[PDB]
């Protein structure tokens, strides 16, 4: 899993908003700098900026 290093407020419908410290699963990461992620905290799924998260381990 990955962990959010910052909060992120959605800027389009298909973005995923998240809070610092939230755990995320990267569902797809082949479409560039924005990755499709699923929040293990909220259950929502959407695109995130890949530089706002880090590997958990």
């Amino acid at each position: 899993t990955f962990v959010a290093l910052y909060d992120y407020v959605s800027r389009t419908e298909t973005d995923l908003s998240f809070k610092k410290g939230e755990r995320l699963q990267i569902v797809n990461n082949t479409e560039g700098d924005w990755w499709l992620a699923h929040s293990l905290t909220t259950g929502r799924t959407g695109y995130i900026p890949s530089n706002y998260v880090a590997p958990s381990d």
């Binding site: 910052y6 560039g32 700098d33 924005w34 900026p49 706002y52």
Partner: peptide, 7 residues
Amino acid sequence: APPLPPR
């Protein structure tokens, strides 16, 4: 926060 990357 870091600059948001291009979409």
